[PDB]
Each structure stands twice: as C-alpha cells, then as structure tokens.
C-alpha cells in the first residue's frame, strides 16, 4: 500500500514498514508516531532513530540490541519506554529500516 501524509507518500507493507529506506523522511516519523504508541517525539527518540539510521547506512544491518543500548546509553527498559513496541517493530520501523527477519 501507499501512505499519504503531510503531502508525502510512503509505500509500506502489511506491517507498516517502509518498502524503501530511501523514502524515509521526517514526515514518516510523525505519521508512524501513534501506531507505535508515541504521543510526542523527544530528543531521546531522535537519538535512537539517528543511531539506527547511521548504523544501517554504514553496516547494511540493524544493530544488535546490545550495541543499541551500549551506544545510545539507553538500557533495554528505557528503549521500551521510548518505543513501547520495542527496538524492532517500533524503532526500526520509525527509522525506516526494513522489517526484522528470522524466527520471529
């Protein structure tokens, strides 16, 4: 499907992840916000999103949870406070990274 928001269009799949990382933009985050239980984006939310994007651009993969926490300084518990759906379904989705894979 194709999402229309703030004059922007984002192609997405059945789970709401962007079809193409390059179509990411700030409007996407404002769009996804509520779906992922976030009322207002904070400086911390953006620091997570920023990290995830730089890591993906550099490594071609999403960072392991231990790296995400160790780098941002946010423990897993804090990461869930920021993103209720978790680092995968919430943070990665909002950051524009592709849908997690493997067994589960």
């Amino acid at each position: 499907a194709v999402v229309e928001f703030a004059g922007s269009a984002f192609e997405v799949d059945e789970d709401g992840f962007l079809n193409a990382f390059d179509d990411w933009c700030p409007e996407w985050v404002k769009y996804a916000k509520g779906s992922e239980g976030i009322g207002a984006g904070s400086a911390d939310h953006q620091k997570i999103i920023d990290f995830l994007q730089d890591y993906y651009k550099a490594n071609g993969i999403a960072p392991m949870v231990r790296i995400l926490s160790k780098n941002t300084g946010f423990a897993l518990k804090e990461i869930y406070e920021l993103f209720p759906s978790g680092p995968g379904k919430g943070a990665c989705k909002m950051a524009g990274l592709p849908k997690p894979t493997g067994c589960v």
Binding site: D15, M64, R66, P84, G86, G88, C103, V104
Partner: protein
C-alpha cells in the same frame, strides 16, 4: 466452503482427522449457536482448508514470508502471517498465531480451557495447537487489531501471559515430574514455574544474541527431551545407592510382577530372565545376581535407569537427589545439530533453586556479550571453547566433562602457566643457535 477433494481423503482412516475437526468448527461458526459477533470472518477456518487444499495441489506453501506483529510492552509472543492469495481466501489474509503461556506439565481444568476457548472463538479462528513443540498453548489464526484485545482479556480476565518468541528466553517446559511418576528426582514443574516467573523480562523482551530455551526432566529417561530441545537442560538424578527390595526381586523372577510394568505385554517374549533382561543389559555391568540375590556396585552405576525402568517395583531411585545440567542443544542450522553437553554433573535442585539460577545467569552474562548475532549458545561453545564456559561458570574441569579426551595436540596454555612467559628475544636465542 471450497471443494476439497484431496483433504477429504484425510477424513478416512482410524486416527483422529484434523480435517474432520476443522470442518466441524466451520459448521459451528456457520450456525453460530451462541450468537457471537465474530471479530474475524466467521468463515476463517473455511479459508484455511481452502488454502491448505491449494497447497496440496501445487505442492508449495501459500504463506507470505515473515510478519512482524505484537503487543505493546513485549517484543514477541505473536507469529505474524499473511496469506499470499488474499483475494481468493479473505479469511486468512491475516492469520497470526498467538503463543500462550501454559501451566507446567500441561495440567488443566475444564473451566480454564473453556474460558480460553470463549475468548478465542470470539477473536480468532477457532483453531489451535495443543501444544506447540516448545510448550505454549497455540492460538492459530487472527487479525492484527485483535491482538491487543486478546492480550487484554488474557491478562485482566484469565490471568494468563503470552509465551515467548524471538531472540530471547522461550517458554520453559517440564516433564510431569513428581506429579505422577516415581522416578522423579526433583520437582520439575516447580522449577519450571519458578524460573518462568523469575525470568519474565528476559522472555518478553529480546535481549539476547539469539533464542534460548529451558527444559526440565525429572530423570534421564528424558520425557520432555531436555538434552535435545533446550539450550540449558536440567536432568534429575541421585548420588546415593539404588534402593533394592529383594523380595520384589523374587516376585519378578517368579512371574508375579511384570517386567517394565507390562510395556511389552502385547507380545510373547518368553518368561523373564533377570540375567538376560537386566544384569546382562546394564551398560557398566555393575549388577550381579547370585543365589537369588540381586546386588549393585553403585560406585560403577551410571544411573542410566534401565534396571529401574524394568523392575519399578523392586528398584527405586536414591534418596540423595539433585540434577545434572547439560547445555548447548540445538537443531542443525547453522553449524550442525547438538545435544546438551554435560556441564554440572550434580547440583542441588531444591526450591528456590539458587544454584541452578546461578549457573543460568553466569552463562547469560557471558553469552550475551560474547555471542555473535543469531549465534546459539551451543555454537558459541564450539567457537570460543568448552573451557571458556567452565571458567565463566566457575566450574572445575573434570573427566566427566568429556566422552573422550582430545586426540589433537593443538593445546592452548595461559601465559601465566608457562615459565618465562611468551616475550622472548630472538637475539638471545641466536646466541645459542646460529643462523
């Protein structure tokens, strides 16, 4: 209802047919006796058979790759799935599975299961698995919007949580243990329950390099197959003498008591020959039968359970009980299948199980930091070495840790163990040894 020529063929035969059962549920939802307002298409089950029938024809699955769905607060418990012919089978377009935490050894009351069914009939397909291979009550098929609803009902009304999925601790499971077995060396169900409750955060939220499972067996016979299907297996045993009732032994030799409690009854094997069926089958040959008197050199008994399994009424487990911890089991991918390897030969197993929890946490502390992405504990062991595992668990290396010692000489030593260390000057060597 679709035509289902091939599935119909599976309604034939004596074994309970899943097709006949699914069809009965289709009929039920069609009549809707209860007048539910089905939150998903009443014809959901009708479509699963329709798409299953298509798969029989074509020889290929009709589910799209993957899916990422769940409930807030958790990073798993729900296996998302979408059919790849949503126009043909609208009722399984979304067909998610919800993994529900089950009571240890799966003991239930009708009231409880019926309550779960009431919620499911409403919000799902009507279809289940009883039970998933890890242990969970599997609720097979629903739509995304129902998830939060289900989860809310399950917790507020049924005081039941989701099971686990993903790169985390999965649902633990135990054999029935002391509930219904005279071989149980510890309360497997209690340990299973206690550790499931203790480690909830680790089960609901992915913090690990990969998946991790706990399984608890009451004795070596392996009724939950811990040593095969769990990364951390706790298997009961004893350290004192097997209890022998000579008179019962006589009851066997005489015919009054049936060998293996009657397990081979359906066939005429001859009369019981204690020598041929017990003493002569003992792996270590530590048993003796002289003058109508059975004896056991326990020092040389490996507690394989054979004699006990064969003469349950005459031979009992010891009284000094505990368990063995075997780790690393996993299926083939990537690097090959593994069964649990013995780590702690004997450890206490009494509530609140601290010794065992100590080992679990020491392993996690190490593996969490050292394990590579998507690398099972067993594979981390192969890469880094069994000796590292010993070190991090504070376990002294013993002969029991091997089935055989190494036959290569590529032995690693710690610098500190070597006099002089590893810093050498080739200049001084050349003093003795001319180029």
């Amino acid at each position: 209802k679709h035509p289902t020529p091939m599935l119909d063929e599976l309604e034939k035969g004596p074994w309970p047919s899943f097709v006949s059962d699914i069809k009965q549920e289709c009929d039920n939802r069609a009549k809707n006796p209860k007048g539910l307002d089905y939150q998903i298409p009443a014809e959901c089950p009708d479509d699963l058979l329709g798409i299953l029938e298509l798969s029989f024809h074509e020889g290929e699955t009709h589910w799209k790759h993957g899916g990422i769905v769940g409930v807030f607060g958790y990073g798993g418990g729900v296996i998302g799935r979408y059919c790849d012919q949503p126009e043909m089978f609208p009722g399984v377009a979304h067909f998610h599975t919800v993994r529900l935490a089950q009571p240890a050894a799966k003991y239930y009351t009708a009231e409880y299961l019926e309550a779960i069914c009431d919620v499911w009939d409403l919000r799902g397909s009507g279809l289940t698995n009883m039970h998933g291979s890890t242990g969970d009550i599997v609720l097979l098929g629903t739509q995304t919007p129902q998830l939060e609803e289900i989860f809310f009902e399950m917790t507020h009304n049924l005081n039941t949580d989701l099971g686990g999925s993903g790169s985390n601790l999965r649902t633990p499971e135990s054999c029935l243990g002391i509930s219904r077995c005279e071989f149980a060396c510890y309360d497997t169900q209690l340990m299973c329950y206690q550790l499931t409750q203790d480690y909830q955060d680790e089960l609901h939220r992915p913090a690990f390099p990969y998946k991790f499972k706990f399984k608890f067996d009451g004795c070596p016979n392996g009724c939950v197959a811990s040593m095969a299907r769990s990364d951390f297996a706790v298997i009961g045993t004893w350290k004192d003498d097997i209890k022998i009732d000579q008179e019962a032994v006589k009851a066997y030799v005489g015919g009054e008591f049936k060998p293996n409690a009657g397990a081979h009854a359906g066939r005429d094997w001859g009369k019981f020959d204690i020598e041929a069926e017990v003493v002569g089958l003992c792996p270590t040959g530590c048993m003796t039968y002289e003058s109508g008197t059975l004896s056991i050199d326990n020092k040389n008994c490996t507690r394989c359970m054979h004699c006990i399994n064969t003469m349950p009424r005459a031979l009992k487990i010891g009284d000094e009980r505990g368990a063995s911890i075997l780790v690393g089991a996993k299926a083939p991918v990537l690097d090959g299948a593994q069964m649990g390897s013995l780590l702690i030969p004997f450890i206490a197993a009494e509530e609140p199980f601290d010794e065992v929890k100590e080992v679990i946490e020491n392993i996690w502390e190490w593996w969490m930091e050292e394990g590579k992405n998507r690398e099972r504990l067993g594979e981390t062991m192969k890469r880094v070495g069994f000796q590292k595992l010993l070190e991090v668990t504070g376990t002294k290396a013993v002969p029991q840790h091997v089935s055989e010692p190494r036959h290569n000489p590529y032995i690693f030593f710690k610098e500190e163990e070597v006099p002089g260390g590893w810093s050498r000057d080739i200049s001084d060597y050349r003093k003795r040894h001319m180029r």
